[PDB]
Amino acid sequence: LCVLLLLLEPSPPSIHPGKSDLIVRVGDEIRLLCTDPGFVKWTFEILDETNENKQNEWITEKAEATNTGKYTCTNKHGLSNSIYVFVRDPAKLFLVDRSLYGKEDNDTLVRCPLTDPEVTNYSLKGCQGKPLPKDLRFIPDPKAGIMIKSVKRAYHRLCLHCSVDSVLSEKFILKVRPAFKAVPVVSVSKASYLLREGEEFTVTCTIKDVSSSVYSTWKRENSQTKLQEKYNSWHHGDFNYERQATLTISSARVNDSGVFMCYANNTFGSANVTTTLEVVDKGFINIFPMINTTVFVNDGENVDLIVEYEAFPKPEHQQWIYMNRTFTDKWEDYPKSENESNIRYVSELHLTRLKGTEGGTYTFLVSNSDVNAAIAFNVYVNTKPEILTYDRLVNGMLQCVAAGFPEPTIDWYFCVLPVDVQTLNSGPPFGKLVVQSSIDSSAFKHCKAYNDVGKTSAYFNFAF
Numbered sequence: 411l412c413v414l415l416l417l418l419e420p421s422p423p424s425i426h427p428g429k430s431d432l433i434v435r436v437g438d439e440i441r442l443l444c445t446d447p448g449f450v451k452w453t454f455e456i457l458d459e460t461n462e463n464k465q466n467e468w469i470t471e472k473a474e475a476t477n478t479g480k481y482t483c484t485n486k487h488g489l490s491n492s493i494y495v496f497v498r499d500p501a502k503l504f505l506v507d508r509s510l511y512g513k514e515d516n517d518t519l520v521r522c523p524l525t526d527p528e529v530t531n532y533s534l535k536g537c538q539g540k541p542l543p544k545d546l547r548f549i550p551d552p553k554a555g556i557m558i559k560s561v562k563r564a565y566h567r568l569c570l571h572c573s574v575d576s577v578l579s580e581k582f583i584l585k586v587r588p589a590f591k592a593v594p595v596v597s598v599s600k601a602s603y604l605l606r607e608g609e610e611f612t613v614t615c616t617i618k619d620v621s622s623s624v625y626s627t628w629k630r631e632n633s634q635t636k637l638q639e640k641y642n643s644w645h646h647g648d649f650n651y652e653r654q655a656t657l658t659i660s661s662a663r664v665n666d667s668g669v670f671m672c673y674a675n676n677t678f679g680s681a682n683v684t685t686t687l688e689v690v691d692k693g694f695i696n697i698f699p700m701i702n703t704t705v706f707v708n709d710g711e712n713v714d715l716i717v718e719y720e721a722f723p724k725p726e727h728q729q730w731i732y733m734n735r736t737f738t739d740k741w742e743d744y745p746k747s748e749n750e751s752n753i754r755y756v757s758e759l760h761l762t763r764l765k766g767t768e769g770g771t772y773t774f775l776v777s778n779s780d781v782n783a784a785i786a787f788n789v790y791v792n793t794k795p796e797i798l799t800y801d802r803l804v805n806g807m808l809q810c811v812a813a814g815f816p817e818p819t820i821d822w823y824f825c826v827l828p829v830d831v832q833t834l835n836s837g838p839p840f841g842k843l844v845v846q847s848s849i850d851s852s853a854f855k856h857c858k859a860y861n862d863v864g865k866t867s868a869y870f871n872f873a874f
């Protein structure tokens with residue numbers, strides 16, 4: 411009601427005039443009145459603008475367009491009330507904040523509140539000719555602006571105008587920040603390093619993601635340094651970003667070695683890729699026979715001497731030798747895996763149809779720039795005992811000496827059996843054990859070797 415003409419529960423503050431919004435001609439005075447015995451201030455607020463006035467009556471003599479907005483009366487008891495003031499200007503139907511930014515999946519408010527609400531259709535429209543995309547929603551408000559609903563990444567760098575019944579707006583360029591909808595994609599330049607005390611350790615973690623906000627870090631795993639990374643980053647467009655953080659150690663020392671992990675994280679989720687590094691101070695090699703180093707073969711059969719082994723640096727010399735003489739003729743060689751981390755090899759020596767003669771000791775040799783290493787396979791072959799030598803050192807004692815495999819046992823016969831006078835025999839031959847037995851012959855009246863394989867004989871004769 412109009413206020414008495416005075417000639418001359420705790421309540422919220424009263425305002426005059428008692429209206430919600432008030433249209434006011436440009437250049438005309440804005441006269442607002444607040445009645446509250448415990449009044450404090452009137453706050454005015456268009457867009458980000460803010461202003462205070464500690465006088466119960468707000469008076470602006472020559473209203474401008476900018477003067478359009480929310481007028482809130484507030485009392486000491488914490489309580490308030492507001493009224494909105496539209497200052498219609500035939501010229502300016504929009505005061506604006508061109509700065510438009512939205513976040514994918516959240517709403518956005520275009521800031522073009524109008525200074526005149528006596529208009530018929532508050533809608534959203536085109537840009538430089540063209541109209542709008544479909545699926546796009548907007549719930550407009552004369553007091554706030556127009557709120558584009560549930561922005562899509564697709565709307566990036568879009569341009570648009572404020573619609574109402576038609577009105578000329580000003581130029582806006584939409585900018586959509588993206589939502590993380592996928593863990594970061596992280597990679598390393600090389601998953602593994604075999605190093606030599608003294609050289610330079612280097613690596614580049616590569617992280618690709620949709621926003622400069624991705625969190626990435628290197629992690630010397632048992633944690634001492636955070637020893638600086640050398641960052642650098644690119645932006646391949648709008649939602650494509652990649653950053654490289656190269657890790658380096660000028661002088662690689664044994665102690666260094668461990669797993670360096672590249673961690674990446676974003677509000678969606680996290681991802682890590684690991685690279686292990688081992689630094690050695692001596693070129694090395696160690697072998698691995700794949701069968702007993704001792705081997706037995708039957709007369710006509712075959713064998714494969716196999717052996718794997720670990721070498722770093724890569725080998726540059728390797729052979730098989732039988733009698734102080736190497737091969738060219740019956741052996742294989744090959745990397746175990748053809749990765750980049752392969753330090754491991756394998757060689758086979760294919761002995762075939764080997765006659766009882768091929769018995770002996772076989773050696774495999776291999777070396778790199780720093781070390782040489784080798785191991786020996788003792789190959790015993792089964793063969794018929796050969797009578798090395800028949801002797802007659804005389805107490806009349808007759809001797810007989812043979813070799814073969816397995817060890818050859820010597821039985822004697824007169825013409826029953828004699829006894830023995832001997833025993834073992836330590837060198838070459840290799841892969842053949844030698845037997846030595848003797849008899850006395852001092853008993854009158856007118857030499858057999860054998861083992862699990864064969865039996866040979868030599869013969870003596872004498873007379874009483």
Ligand SMILES: *[C@@H]1O[C@H](CO)[C@@H](O)[C@H](O)[C@H]1NC(C)=O
Binds near residue numbers: 513514515516589
């Ligand atoms: C936007 O806000 C809603 C809640 O209103 C939230 O759940 C949604 O995730 C937000 N959008 C994004 C992708 O941050």
Ligand SMILES: *[C@@H]1O[C@H](CO)[C@@H](O)[C@H](O)[C@H]1NC(C)=O
Binds near residue numbers: 625675676677678680
């Ligand atoms: C990864 O991001 C999530 C989401 O904000 C956060 O809770 C967490 O602290 C982050 N962890 C790391 C390793 O930065």
Ligand SMILES: *[C@@H]1O[C@H](CO)[C@@H](O)[C@H](O)[C@H]1NC(C)=O
Binds near residue numbers: 680681
């Ligand atoms: C690293 O990733 C592996 C493989 O997905 C996962 O099992 C582990 O939880 C991750 N570690 C950290 C600390 O994020």
Ligand SMILES: *[C@@H]1O[C@H](CO)[C@@H](O)[C@H](O)[C@H]1NC(C)=O
Binds near residue numbers: 702704
């Ligand atoms: C075969 O090698 C094993 C050890 O790996 C050993 O115990 C054995 O003596 C060898 N074979 C024979 C019959 O000697």
Ligand SMILES: *[C@@H]1O[C@H](CO)[C@@H](O)[C@H](O)[C@H]1NC(C)=O
Binds near residue numbers: 747748749
């Ligand atoms: C190669 O790296 C190691 C060494 O050979 C092996 O264990 C692994 O299976 C291989 N991985 C790749 C790159 O396929």
